[PDB]
Amino acid sequence: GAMNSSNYAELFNNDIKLFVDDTNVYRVTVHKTFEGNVATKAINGCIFTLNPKTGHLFLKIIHTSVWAGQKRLSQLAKWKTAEEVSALVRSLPKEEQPKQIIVTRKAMLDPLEVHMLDFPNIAIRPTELRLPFSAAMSIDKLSDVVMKATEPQMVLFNIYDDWLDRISSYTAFSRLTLLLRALKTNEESAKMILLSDPTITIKSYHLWPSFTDEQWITIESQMRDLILTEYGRKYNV
Amino acid sequence: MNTVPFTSAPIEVTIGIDQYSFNVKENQPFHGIKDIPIGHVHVIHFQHADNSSMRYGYWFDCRMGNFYIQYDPKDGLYKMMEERDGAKFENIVHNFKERQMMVSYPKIDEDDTWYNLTEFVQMDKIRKIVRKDENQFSYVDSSMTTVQENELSDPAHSLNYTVINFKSREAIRPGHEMEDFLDKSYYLNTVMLQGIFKNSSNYFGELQFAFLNAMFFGNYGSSLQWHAMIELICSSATVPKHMLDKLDEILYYQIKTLPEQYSDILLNERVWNICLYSSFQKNSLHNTEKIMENKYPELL
Numbered sequence: 274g275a276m277n278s279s280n281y282a283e284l285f286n287n288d289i290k291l292f293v294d295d296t297n298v299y300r301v302t303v304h305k306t307f308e309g310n311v312a313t314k315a316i317n318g319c320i321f322t323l324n325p326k327t328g329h330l331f332l333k334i335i336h337t338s339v340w341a342g343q344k345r346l347s348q349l350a351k352w353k354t355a356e357e358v359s360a361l362v363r364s365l366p367k368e369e370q371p372k373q374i375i376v377t378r379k380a381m382l383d384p385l386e387v388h389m390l391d392f393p394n395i396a397i398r399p400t401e402l403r404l405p406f407s408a409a410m411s412i413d414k415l416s417d418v419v420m421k422a423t424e425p426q427m428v429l430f431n432i433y434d435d436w437l438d439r440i441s442s443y444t445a446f447s448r449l450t451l452l453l454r455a456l457k458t459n460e461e462s463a464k465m466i467l468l469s470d471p472t473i474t475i476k477s478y479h480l481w482p483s484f485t486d487e488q489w490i491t492i493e494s495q496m497r498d499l500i501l502t503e504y505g506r507k508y509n510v
Numbered sequence: 511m512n513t514v515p516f517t518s519a520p521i522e523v524t525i526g527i528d529q530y531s532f533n534v535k536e537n538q539p540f541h542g543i544k545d546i547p548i549g550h551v552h553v554i555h556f557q558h559a560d561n562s563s564m565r566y567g568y569w570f571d572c573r574m575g576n577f578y579i580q581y582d583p584k585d586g587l588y589k590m591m592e593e594r595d596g597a598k599f600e601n602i603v604h605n606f607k608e609r610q611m612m613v614s615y616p617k618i619d620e621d622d623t624w625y626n627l628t629e630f631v632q633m634d635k636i637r638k639i640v641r642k643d644e645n646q647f648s649y650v651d652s653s654m655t656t657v658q659e660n661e662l663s664d665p666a667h668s669l670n671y672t673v674i675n676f677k678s679r680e681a682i683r684p685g686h687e688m689e690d691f692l693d694k695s696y697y698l699n700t701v702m703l704q705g706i707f708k709n710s711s712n713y714f715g716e717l718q719f720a721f722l723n724a725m726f727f728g729n730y731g732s733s734l735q736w737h738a739m740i741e742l743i744c745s746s747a748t749v750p751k752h753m754l755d756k757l758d759e760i761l762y763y764q765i766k767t768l769p770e771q772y773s774d775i776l777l778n779e780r781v782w783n784i785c786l787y788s789s790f791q792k793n794s795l796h797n798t799e800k801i802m803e804n805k806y807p808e809l810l
């Protein structure tokens with residue numbers, strides 16, 4: 274059934290699972306026409322498919338050409354998501370295929386179920402958690418590869434960098450969700466926190482800066498403050 | 511006009527014959543039902559006074575044999591049987607008629623209700639849904655489960671309705687996932703009509719039989735089947751015009767006949783609101799929508 278706080282440690286057991294977030298698949302700018310009407314212009318998007326145990330991010334870039342001449346794009350985007358996730362599963366060796374796929378939005382349940390009819394033993398699950406995966410496009414290297422794409426493309430990243438050499442999957446996921454929650458609540462401040470000290474760099478092969486254990490504790494505390502800070506600015510507390 | 515005699519009425523029971531019903535008291539001198547219209551299937555059904563649990567009954571067609579009812583005190587129910595000795599049967603019936611111990615099927619001349627509820631229902635098709643090949647009539651009760659219900663437990667006592675499942679490989683062509691799920695025309699016209707039912711008359715016959723078993727026995731899996739067969743049509747963008755017009759007539763008479771006080775359990779809010787207001791055929795069921803809105807406006 275649904276994934277929630279009660280069954281949270283299941284994410285880090287040894288049954289392969291993937292989260293699928295479709296928030297950033299269909300992205301538009303809304304603008305005025307010369308006649309003073311409103312129109313949309315699509316921009317490239319992406320499916321965010323993540324193994325929370327290993328940090329494996331299968332980033333399928335959705336190029337704007339896939340919308341050309343199509344109607345009801347927000348509905349189509351869910352089905353296109355499910356088609357691409359199904360294609361990814363089929364492309365993986367049997368021993369790498371997931372035993373569960375957790376969708377971050379319940380509207381993805383039926384499209385994914387239908388596309389995965391050929392895999393009756395893969396469970397398609399919703400979640401009660403409000404995960405901040407929409408903020409994925411606030412990670413500069415991910416946004417860069419999405420916006421530069423000129424055709425459909427899959428790009429493989431590890432979203433935990435090398436953190437699993439020093440921390441467990443549970444702790445890595447908590448750190449990731451904290452960083453993303455911060456970027457989602459106040460992107461400018463969050464990014465200021467992450468880069469303020471010019472001596473800490475992001476390795477070419479990494480997404481986040483190369484913080485020591487002690488520096489991660491400081492960083493993590495600053496992100497919590499921000500999420501609380503912004504929570505006051507919003508609710509006047 | 512044909513007759514279903516009863517040997518006796520040893521236990522107090524409410525007896526139905528099609529949409530009619532009457533109460534018989536314990537050991538009351540009741541010996542059956544006469545003047546049954548020829549040309550239609552019929553259902554004779556029972557609810558005991560002491561245990562309203564288990565409504566049960568028999569579908570039959572008097573053109574297929576001479577049938578009678580006899581209570582079995584071991585199994586505790588009124589059983590239908592066939593009499594093969596035609597002269598014995600005619601003689602039994604004539605004596606009961608002479609002593610006026612039979613109720614008359616009470617059909618008003620103007621009234622086409624039973625025809626309209628059974629237009630496409632044939633005994634031969636009933637006998638394939640309800641498998642008991644040694645009898646010409648078919649037993650149904652409130653508790654019997656459907657083949658589909660069993661897949662989700664005695665196979666011989668099952669209702670073998672055609673399985674309909676909108677999230678199934680049968681319903682969804684590889685590579686037309688979104689198309690077939692949002693527009694079920696493929697599944698309706700190719701898989702079901704051309705493939706399984708052969709024609710719309712057989713589809714409507716099964717839909718009508720499912721409704722009648724839901725209404726008369728409170729059979730829950732039959733209600734599920736009836737709604738699934740409605741939803742499959744309404745959720746198809748491409749349906750022959752004659753089928754939509756006939757469906758509107760079928761459902762109109764089903765909704766007209768439904769006991770007002772059973773609507774809460776026999777009608778699925780989601781299916782009906784979707785069918786009348788959101789589906790491709792939301793504008794094609796004029797008669798059904800008018801009766802539903804005037805009779806069950808709460809559900810909607």
Ligand SMILES: Nc1cccc(C(=O)N2CCOCC2)c1
Pocket residue numbers: 328329330331429430431
């Ligand atoms: N999606 C996915 C699957 C397998 C491995 C990886 C992974 O760790 N990375 C591969 C690409 O760059 C190095 C890091 C990612």
